[PDB]
Amino acid sequence: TPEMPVLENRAAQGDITAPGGARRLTGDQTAALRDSLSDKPAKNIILLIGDGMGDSEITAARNYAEGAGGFFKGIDALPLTGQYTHYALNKKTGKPDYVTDGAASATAWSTGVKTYNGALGVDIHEKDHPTILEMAKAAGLATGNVSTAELQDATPAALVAHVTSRKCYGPSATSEKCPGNALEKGGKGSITEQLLNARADVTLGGGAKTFAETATAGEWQGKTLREQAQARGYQLVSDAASLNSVTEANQQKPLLGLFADGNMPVRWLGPKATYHGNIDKPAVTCTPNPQRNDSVPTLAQMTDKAIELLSKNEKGFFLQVEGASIDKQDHAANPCGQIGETVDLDEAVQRALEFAKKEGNTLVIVTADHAHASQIVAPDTKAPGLTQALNTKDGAVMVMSYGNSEEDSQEHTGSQLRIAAYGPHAANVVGLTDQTDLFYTMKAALGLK
Amino acid sequence: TPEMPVLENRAAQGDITAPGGARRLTGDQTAALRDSLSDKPAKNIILLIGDGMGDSEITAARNYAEGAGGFFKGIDALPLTGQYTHYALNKKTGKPDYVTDGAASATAWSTGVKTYNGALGVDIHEKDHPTILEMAKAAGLATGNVSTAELQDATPAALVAHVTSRKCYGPSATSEKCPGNALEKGGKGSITEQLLNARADVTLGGGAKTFAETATAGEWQGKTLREQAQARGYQLVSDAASLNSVTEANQQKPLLGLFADGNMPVRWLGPKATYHGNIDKPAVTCTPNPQRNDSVPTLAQMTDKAIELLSKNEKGFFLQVEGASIDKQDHAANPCGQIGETVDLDEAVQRALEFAKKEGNTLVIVTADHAHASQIVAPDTKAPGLTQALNTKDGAVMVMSYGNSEEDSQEHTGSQLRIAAYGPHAANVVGLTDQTDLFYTMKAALGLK
Numbered sequence: 065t066p067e068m069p070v071l072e073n074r075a076a077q078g079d080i081t082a083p084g085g086a087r088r089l090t091g092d093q094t095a096a097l098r099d100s101l102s103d104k105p106a107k108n109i110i111l112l113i114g115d116g117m118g119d120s121e122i123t124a125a126r127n128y129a130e131g132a133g134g135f136f137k138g139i140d141a142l143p144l145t146g147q148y149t150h151y152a153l154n155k156k157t158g159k160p161d162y163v164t165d166g167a168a169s170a171t172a173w174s175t176g177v178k179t180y181n182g183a184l185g186v187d188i189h190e191k192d193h194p195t196i197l198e199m200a201k202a203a204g205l206a207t208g209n210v211s212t213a214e215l216q217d218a219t220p221a222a223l224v225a226h227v228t229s230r231k232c233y234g235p236s237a238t239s240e241k242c243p244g245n246a247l248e249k250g251g252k253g254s255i256t257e258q259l260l261n262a263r264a265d266v267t268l269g270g271g272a273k274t275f276a277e278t279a280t281a282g283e284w285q286g287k288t289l290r291e292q293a294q295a296r297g298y299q300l301v302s303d304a305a306s307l308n309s310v311t312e313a314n315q316q317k318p319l320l321g322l323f324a325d326g327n328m329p330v331r332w333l334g335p336k337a338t339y340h341g342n343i344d345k346p347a348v349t350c351t352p353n354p355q356r357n358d359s360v361p362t363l364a365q366m367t368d369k370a371i372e373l374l375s376k377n378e379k380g381f382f383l384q385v386e387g388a389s390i391d392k393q394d395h396a397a398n399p400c401g402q403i404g405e406t407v408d409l410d411e412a413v414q415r416a417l418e419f420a421k422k423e424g425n426t427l428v429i430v431t432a433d434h435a436h437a438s439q440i441v442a443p444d445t446k447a448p449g450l451t452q453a454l455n456t457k458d459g460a461v462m463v464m465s466y467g468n469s470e471e472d473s474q475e476h477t478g479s480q481l482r483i484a485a486y487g488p489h490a491a492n493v494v495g496l497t498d499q500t501d502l503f504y505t506m507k508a509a510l511g512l513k
Numbered sequence: 514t515p516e517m518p519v520l521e522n523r524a525a526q527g528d529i530t531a532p533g534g535a536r537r538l539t540g541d542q543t544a545a546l547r548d549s550l551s552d553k554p555a556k557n558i559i560l561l562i563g564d565g566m567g568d569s570e571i572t573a574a575r576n577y578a579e580g581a582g583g584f585f586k587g588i589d590a591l592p593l594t595g596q597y598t599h600y601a602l603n604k605k606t607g608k609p610d611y612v613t614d615g616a617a618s619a620t621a622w623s624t625g626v627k628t629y630n631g632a633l634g635v636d637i638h639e640k641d642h643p644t645i646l647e648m649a650k651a652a653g654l655a656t657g658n659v660s661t662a663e664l665q666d667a668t669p670a671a672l673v674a675h676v677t678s679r680k681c682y683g684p685s686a687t688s689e690k691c692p693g694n695a696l697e698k699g700g701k702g703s704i705t706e707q708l709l710n711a712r713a714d715v716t717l718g719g720g721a722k723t724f725a726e727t728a729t730a731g732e733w734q735g736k737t738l739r740e741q742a743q744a745r746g747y748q749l750v751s752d753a754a755s756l757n758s759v760t761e762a763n764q765q766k767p768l769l770g771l772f773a774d775g776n777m778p779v780r781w782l783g784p785k786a787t788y789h790g791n792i793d794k795p796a797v798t799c800t801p802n803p804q805r806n807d808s809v810p811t812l813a814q815m816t817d818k819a820i821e822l823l824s825k826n827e828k829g830f831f832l833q834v835e836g837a838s839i840d841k842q843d844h845a846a847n848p849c850g851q852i853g854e855t856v857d858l859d860e861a862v863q864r865a866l867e868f869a870k871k872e873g874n875t876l877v878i879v880t881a882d883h884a885h886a887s888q889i890v891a892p893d894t895k896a897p898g899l900t901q902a903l904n905t906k907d908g909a910v911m912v913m914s915y916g917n918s919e920e921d922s923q924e925h926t927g928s929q930l931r932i933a934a935y936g937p938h939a940a941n942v943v944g945l946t947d948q949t950d951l952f953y954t955m956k957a958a959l960g961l962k
């Protein structure tokens with residue numbers, strides 16, 4: 065029944081200076097909560113991942129774009145919540161590695177088995193395990209993979225590739241870093257080659273550059289990975305106009321959208337945080353990114369078309385969407401770039417719920433692969449790292465700190481983080497769980513075996 | 514019905530290197546969750562605050578004392594979870610201050626009205642508003658206030674004092690910083706004086722030192738605050754032995770335990786984090802604190818006696834327990850001191866749930882006032898701040914970083930953080946809520962007006 069509620073408005077109710085004015089709740093949630101619980105099987109699953117979107121990343125984005133008492137229409141409107149752990153494993157010893165990377169974590173929600181950082185679709189012994197996209201496809205469901213990063217990147221790759229090192233993008237690199245994976249050595253092939261092999265119905269993102277390499281062995285040996293895609297019946301799109309034109313995407317006519325050479329461009333602009341930037345520099349106000357060409361589709365646009373095409377399959381669909389640069393910008397210590405991307409992920413989460421709400425059998429999940437560096441500190445702060453002051457929507461200054469790395473790249477962190485869901489089987493994300501339970505939650509919802 | 518479950522075992526189910534081995538869930542939670550939902554009124558309420566206990570603080574403690582795949586028998590066993598916001602207000606402008614202190618936040622969950630940092634029980638206008646402990650007492654319910662910090666510190670004081678500055682501990686300071694509060698100027702009195710006025714049934718913690726001042730005005734002017742307590746029917750205890758002897762604590766015979774001049778001592782020892790400590794210094798293994806005399810009671814012991822005493826009142830009770838030094842040690846950049854205290858709080862949370870489980874009408878809440886500085890980073894990290902390497906229970910190294918302040922004290926952070934509950938009306942903590950909603954959830958559960 066379309067009787068399961070999405071959080072309507074969790075914004076502050078009134079005057080935050082007045083008693084009860086900062087409240088986000090209007091009444092008791094006991095009933096509404098009872099109405100969100102359902103162990104009926106999910107027909108569809110949309111999994112939204114914001115790379116590096118820890119609770120801290122979620123708070124700074126809200127504080128700035130919607131103000132402290134604000135509310136993310138998408139990101140915050142999911143009724144059921146919990147916290148989950150995402151530690152990885154040390155390759156040699158098999159003990160825990162408290163801070164995972166994009167590859168070991170992505171692998172965990174995809175296969176349900178922990179692995180060492182850098183691995184994609186294999187356990188610590190180097191044995192392959194089937195991904196949820198692969199199991200979806202086998203049962204007859206439709207499949208989609210959407211991201212704002214190069215399709216070869218860890219997060220989207222973890223669903224279609226089984227390599228020993230995330231560096232094995234296309235043919236050349238594979239030969240050198242994943243020899244037992246290289247096609248000419250009789251391996252399954254590079255990440256790019258295994259993606260074309262996988263043949264999901266809809267694949268959208270960046271990474272057009274690796275597609276320029278020519279394979280070394282196999283049927284298409286000699287031909288660039290791009291000619292092969294063509295040669296195998298893939299529809300190729302490079303912009304919004306083209307994307308808007310596709311009316312079908314199935315096994316006979318799978319869709320492949322390559323919107324950028326490398327990663328798709330970020331939405332906002334802002335300088336990079338600096339030492340004492342909060343006390344030596346004026347407050348910043350993010351502005352749109354000039355280089356972002358009007359033709360490059362947005363995550364929400366892409367999520368919209370994907371869901372439109374995929375929902376045709378009467379059996380069902382599984383889709384994974386990732387706002388990839390929150391993390392990348394968090395690594396670069398660029399508050400504006402980071403917040404812009406969280407806002408961008410929120411627009412897509414809204415499209416997800418919209419469909420969810422009116423269909424009634426879609427399970428939607430929103431979370432991140434791990435926590436990151438960014439911190440929200442006081443304005444008078446004298447930090448050892450990189451800081452910047454922002455003018456928020458509250459019309460107040462907000463200071464952000466990056467202080468875990470003194471190298472050119474800010475580092476991930478291992479704190480447990482938020483996981484939120486809405487729909488059939490959402491109860492399984494409440495409480496403390498582990499990134500791997502997610503794999504199991506999905507599989508059970510769709511009734512895969 | 515005692516049919517409402519607490520989370521049994523959320524530890525990894527088996528071999529974490531194996532498929533399904535890291536899972537924390539055994540089945541579907543939809544039913545178990547349905548059985549945790551109840552809008553029946555709560556007869557009692559126990560509120561446990563870990564000062565500065567952000568998700569990061571909880572992860573590190575677990576990683577160390579229980580290992581990555583571990584599970585806090587108390588802190589992690591609460592079935593319903595959410596994330597809540599705790600921003601404060603700028604005094605002048607009344608706009609949000611994204612990073613609150615111990616006072617503004619404590620005031621928020623006590624009165625339900627946001628305030629500026631430093632304030633205890635008054636809004637930005639300086640108007641007093643009633644605390645949840647006060648409303649409890651008026652309804653006839655029994656009340657208790659437990660903490661390991663000076664009873665005059667922000668967290669426990671926010672429940673019984675209405676001053677303009679948290680610095681107004683006893684008579685002297687009040688006269689100079691809260692003149693319009695000073696007893697001699699016709700004010701309600703210093704924090705300490707207002708505490709003895711409040712007359713909760715059970716009050717345990719530190720801060721014996723301030724009780725040595727003599728009041729300036731009123732009926733007991735001339736007499737030290739201690740003689741006054743005695744003069745007003747207060748039982749005074751200073752250690753375990755003495756504490757174990759009380760068999761009654763009511764309005765006629767209220768219990769006041771002062772177990773330390775300042776803050777009670779921390780449980781573990783370990784050196785302080787240092788610049789490149791993780792790379793220039795050997796891994797650390799915390800050890801018990803030599804100075805912690807065997808006679809100073811522990812948080813769990815105190816929670817145990819208090820609940821024992823308070824549960825006599827047939828009408829009900831309201832209790833607040835605080836593990837205060839997680840924050841203090843977090844400020845001091847001492848990983849062992851911080852982790853020892855979280856474990857200590859976990860023991861109390863266990864004692865809380867034990868009662869809850871068998872009584873059936875108690876609502877238990879475990880959360881923090883705000884997030885803090887500590888981060889869990891990679892072993893080879895080269896950070897600008899303070900780091901240290903620990904040998905966890907997994908027999909692996911874990912590195913912790915402190916890098917938001919270059920002053921002698923590490924700073925708070927403003928990330929939304931976990932809030933977990935078990936019992937009647939626990940549904941109101943799921944999803945995104947604000948620290949003030951907590952004031953309203955408790956009041957409605959106990960049916961206060």
Ligand SMILES: [Mg+2]
Binds near residue numbers: 219
């Ligand atoms: Mg990614």
Ligand SMILES: [Mg+2]
Binds near residue numbers: 564615666667668
């Ligand atoms: Mg405190």
Ligand SMILES: [Zn+2]
Binds near residue numbers: 115116391433434
């Ligand atoms: Zn990542």
Ligand SMILES: [Zn+2]
Binds near residue numbers: 116392
């Ligand atoms: Zn990263």
Ligand SMILES: [Zn+2]
Binds near residue numbers: 565615883
């Ligand atoms: Zn605090």
Ligand SMILES: [Zn+2]
Binds near residue numbers: 844
């Ligand atoms: Zn503090």
